[PDB]
Amino acid sequence: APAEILNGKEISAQIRARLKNQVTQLKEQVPGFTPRLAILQVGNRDDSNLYINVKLKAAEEIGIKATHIKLPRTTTESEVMKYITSLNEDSTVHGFLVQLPLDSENSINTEEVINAIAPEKDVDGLTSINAGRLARGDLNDCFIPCTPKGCLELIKETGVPIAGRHAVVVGRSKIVGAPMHDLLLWNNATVTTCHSKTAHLDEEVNKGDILVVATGQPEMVKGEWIKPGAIVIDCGINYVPDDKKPNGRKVVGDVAYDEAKERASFITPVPGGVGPMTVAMLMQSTVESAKRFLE
Amino acid sequence: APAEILNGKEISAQIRARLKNQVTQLKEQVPGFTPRLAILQVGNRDDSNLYINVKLKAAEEIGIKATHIKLPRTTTESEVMKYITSLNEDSTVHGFLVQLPLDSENSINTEEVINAIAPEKDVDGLTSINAGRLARGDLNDCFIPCTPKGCLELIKETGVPIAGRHAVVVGRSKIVGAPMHDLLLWNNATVTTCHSKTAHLDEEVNKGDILVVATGQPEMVKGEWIKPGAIVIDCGINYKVVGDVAYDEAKERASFITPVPGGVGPMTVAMLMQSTVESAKRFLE
Numbered sequence A: 001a002p003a004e005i006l007n008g009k010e011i012s013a014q015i016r017a018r019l020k021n022q023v024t025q026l027k028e029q030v031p032g033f034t035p036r037l038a039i040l041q042v043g044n045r046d047d048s049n050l051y052i053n054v055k056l057k058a059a060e061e062i063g064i065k066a067t068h069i070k071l072p073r074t075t076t077e078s079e080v081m082k083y084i085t086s087l088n089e090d091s092t093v094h095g096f097l098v099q100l101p102l103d104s105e106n107s108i109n110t111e112e113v114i115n116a117i118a119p120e121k122d123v124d125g126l127t128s129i130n131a132g133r134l135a136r137g138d139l140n141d142c143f144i145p146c147t148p149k150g151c152l153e154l155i156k157e158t159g160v161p162i163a164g165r166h167a168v169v170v171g172r173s174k175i176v177g178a179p180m181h182d183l184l185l186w187n188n189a190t191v192t193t194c195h196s197k198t199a200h201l202d203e204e205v206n207k208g209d210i211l212v213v214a215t216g217q218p219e220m221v222k223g224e225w226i227k228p229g230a231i232v233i234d235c236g237i238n239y240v241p242d243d244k245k246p247n248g249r250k251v252v253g254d255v256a257y258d259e260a261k262e263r264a265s266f267i268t269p270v271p272g273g274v275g276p277m278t279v280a281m282l283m284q285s286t287v288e289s290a291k292r293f294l295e
Numbered sequence B: 001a002p003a004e005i006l007n008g009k010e011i012s013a014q015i016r017a018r019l020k021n022q023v024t025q026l027k028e029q030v031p032g033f034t035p036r037l038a039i040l041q042v043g044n045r046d047d048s049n050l051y052i053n054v055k056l057k058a059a060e061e062i063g064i065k066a067t068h069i070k071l072p073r074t075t076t077e078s079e080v081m082k083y084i085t086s087l088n089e090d091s092t093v094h095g096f097l098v099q100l101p102l103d104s105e106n107s108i109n110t111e112e113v114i115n116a117i118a119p120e121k122d123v124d125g126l127t128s129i130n131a132g133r134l135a136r137g138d139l140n141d142c143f144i145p146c147t148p149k150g151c152l153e154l155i156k157e158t159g160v161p162i163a164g165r166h167a168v169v170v171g172r173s174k175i176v177g178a179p180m181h182d183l184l185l186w187n188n189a190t191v192t193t194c195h196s197k198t199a200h201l202d203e204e205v206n207k208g209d210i211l212v213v214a215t216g217q218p219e220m221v222k223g224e225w226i227k228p229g230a231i232v233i234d235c236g237i238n239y240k241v242v243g244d245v246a247y248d249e250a251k252e253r254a255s256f257i258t259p260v261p262g263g264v265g266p267m268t269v270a271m272l273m274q275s276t277v278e279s280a281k282r283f284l285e
């Protein structure tokens, strides 16, 4: 009885399809309404361009007007701040994000920039005000970072209720681990948060009916650790050379999939699990902001 | 045979003495300067009146100027917002707080009222900005809620390092449980948070090398559940007054335990005073 596979590519495809239908219907119910997203970029990083173009493409297909503002490497902190204030003030923009890391020849305080974003438009959900609402239970209107938001969606796709179950989160970063704990707690699971200072991590992990790993340590969580019948969500994206792959490298998660798939009731593969869910989640957060503004 | 008693009344007395001397030196450095704290109350609850009096009394003794504003029960959210704005703008007020729960005959959104407070004067650390910094590990920039702070201080009095320990927090409120989890997590403990929907609460509590209970349910946490040699922190104030932990039984299993009363509560007021003296000092800096 091996684990059922949570196909993030298929699930995300469905989500994006539904968001398109939702966006079409919003526009028809309120003629003139245009759900709008804006992405602020500083510099010209190769990886950022690729990530941005993918977000813009997903946006246009769903019918969300996506605006890309690209500032030069010569940009200063005050200029970035000026744009954030203008985006906050632009009533035609429902949500926006600052693509990180910033690429400038000048010293720019990333944290101050991010925290200048109006909470009601913070689709990436990384502002302190937003992290604060999420951490304290205001799940009804706050924004949720794309990765942990995708993880909860995958857990819910199993059909197994979260309330009363013991969830274990390995990792406590701002991007994944911390907000992941928040989602699980407010969905009434009993949560245990582990990290690099956690003793007997194997014994801790073995207590999780729901396990979310986001450590960046390739295949560290062995299958032996997994509790029988657990839901395993793996956020790991670790590259390893493999001449037998089309591009000479394979992607492995933070969980030892091959042995974990025999223990778990549900598991996310890598690649193809949590990864494909992220852009859809941002799109979902953008539609949410648009609907809240509309009301 | 029983657990060592964590005397919050004696420990808070030492903190208050330290704070008083700091305030005295600060006034000697800048004669005329006076740290000021303001407490905004809505309604006239008997328990809130006594709690505020304790805070006012600890302040006066430390040398802090404390102002108490009491609004009638007919107060609207709109009116509370006016005073908050006034307190935010009053340069002489370094730190203020809104006493909870608000006692009004009208609906007042508590999160909106609390989030109207300027983060630099949020000594209670209840704003989403302060909660968000704590929730993500940014401890250089924020005010932590007074109860969690007092508890952390009590845990440290045992001398036992927090790092690596499995901590269990029973309760998840914005005032105690949620921020208590954050303090333990960022102090490197492995943390499990329990609430009313937790199944087999006894098995969860048994895993705690450090146990903090803040449920408001009289002696619900049984001593049987306590892990031998555990540090037990009881935030409960339940009506005789008893904690959320069955003390007599728990004391025979724990290594360190907080009594009720005289445990967490005096520590809560001392920490509030510490945050206040801090908000006055950051103002001068």
Ligand SMILES: NC(=O)c1ccc[n+]([C@@H]2O[C@H](COP(=O)([O-])OP(=O)(O)OC[C@H]3O[C@@H](n4cnc5c(N)ncnc54)[C@H](OP(=O)(O)O)[C@@H]3O)[C@@H](O)[C@H]2O)c1
Pocket: A147, A170, A171, A172, A173, A174, A175, A176, A177, A194, A195, A196, A197, A198, A201, A214, A215, A216, A217, A220, A235, A236, A237, A238, A274, A275, A276, A278
């Ligand atoms: N789908 C996506 O596109 C997506 C998005 C974001 C992230 N990810 C992936 O998720 C992973 C996690 O990223 P991150 O944001 O969380 O970065 P990170 O800052 O490196 O997070 C590591 C966290 O896990 C803890 N940790 C480090 N080694 C561990 C170990 N050996 N055992 C137990 N805990 C360990 C660390 O604790 P300390 O706090 O003590 O250091 C830290 O909290 C990355 O591999 C990334 O590829 C994927």
Ligand SMILES: NC(=O)c1ccc[n+]([C@@H]2O[C@H](COP(=O)([O-])OP(=O)(O)OC[C@H]3O[C@@H](n4cnc5c(N)ncnc54)[C@H](OP(=O)(O)O)[C@@H]3O)[C@@H](O)[C@H]2O)c1
Pocket: B147, B170, B171, B172, B173, B174, B175, B176, B177, B194, B195, B196, B197, B198, B201, B214, B215, B216, B217, B220, B235, B236, B237, B238, B264, B265, B266, B268, B269
């Ligand atoms: N010493 C001080 O100065 C000080 C300061 C503040 C508070 N306190 C004391 O701390 C206590 C709790 O305050 P609070 O803000 O946390 O109150 P609260 O808002 O009522 O929160 C109670 C929490 O405990 C959970 N809970 C309820 N019954 C439980 C049960 N049977 N098993 C496990 N969890 C249970 C609830 O879960 P749900 O979220 O699911 O409902 C809730 O999260 C009070 O007695 C208060 O007197 C003392």
Ligand SMILES: Nc1nc(O)c(N)c(NC(=O)Nc2ccc(C(=O)N[C@@H](CCC(=O)O)C(=O)O)cc2)n1
Pocket: B008, B051, B054, B100, B101, B175, B237, B241, B261, B262, B263, B264, B265, B266, B268, B269
């Ligand atoms: N929302 C809300 N809920 C609560 O339960 C409390 N208590 C609160 N605010 C508050 O100020 N709490 C508080 C509680 C106790 C003390 C206190 O000093 N308690 C002492 C003993 C007091 C006594 O003699 O009864 C203690 O030892 O616990 C101070 C503040 N805020």
